[PDB]
Design a protein around this motif. Structure first.
Motif: not given
Lengths: 158, 158
Positions: B2, B7, B10-11, B43, B66-67, B118-119
């Motif tokens: 991804q 992100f 989708f988010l 996010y 998160h990643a 992503l945080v």
């Protein structure tokens, strides 16, 4: 690479009464009640033979996926209704990196795959144990008998 | 495999006035003051071209990971003192999945490597924009002159 052993060690995670490992990361220096604080935050880990058994919280709990395997969170409303949310990064499925488990329900959680799983939890009214209630497998089979199968995956007897 | 595009999509992440991308996840249905709320989470993504420009909050803010790419929180005490922290998943180095950026301090963040990040950000008393404050490169070189080097990265003129 990083195993579960690396995280518990470096993070200094204690065993948790509900299941898995944990360690309070930070706690507000502001208060809500002269009893509890404005918020509490921890690291929460699950190893293969681990799970976070069914328990209820008197406050809302924010879940932040940190790493490892994705989790399936199981929730039973105060009406017997079972729902589930998945936490993680596979956005294609219903996986989200965050999730709010609403106060008042009885929830558990397990990894969707073997390995390890590290998350970040945050309960606003600072977590105390008078805001925590774990449940017996019996106490859970009596109420919600329709959920035998799941209530056995997230609960031990007596 | 991804990437930041998945992100933001989708988010549903929209640009943040301070830079980067964001989307509120949950707010607390409980009130703190008649004004603000008990808490809020959003996010927050960062791409190789984005950095979170120096800004100040009225409340504390928890940071979850998160990643993506380990970040770096550059903070400047009201007394002109620059401190740093390593958010991320490498326990070898001093990287930690959670970090608490104390209120009343001017801070910003950049990634550590090219890629995405992503945080999770949780500010306690509900984040109203009254509790926010972005800063011009001007004022920042005025006050705190000894930190020009980093001010020229997490800030912009005029």
């Amino acid at each position: 690479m990083q195993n579960a052993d690396d995280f518990i060690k470096f993070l200094e995670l204690e065993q948790h009464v509900e299941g898995g490992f944990y360690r309070s990361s930070y706690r507000s220096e502001t208060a809500f009640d002269p009893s509890r604080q404005l918020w509490s935050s921890i690291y929460f880990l699950l190893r293969t033979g681990e799970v976070s058994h069914f328990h209820r919280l008197t406050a809302d709990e924010m879940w932040y996926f940190h790493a490892g395997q994705s989790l399936t969170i199981y929730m039973i409303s105060p009406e017997g209704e079972l729902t589930t949310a998945q936490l993680g990064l596979d956005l294609a499925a219903g996986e989200r990196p965050q999730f709010l488990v609403p106060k008042g329900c009885i929830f558990g959680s397990a990894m969707n795959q073997d390995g390890f799983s590290l998350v970040g939890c945050m309960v606003s009214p600072g977590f105390t144990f008078d805001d925590f209630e774990l449940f017996s497998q019996e106490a859970l089979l009596a109420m919600y008998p329709q959920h035998k199968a799941v209530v056995q995956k997230l609960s031990r007897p007596e």
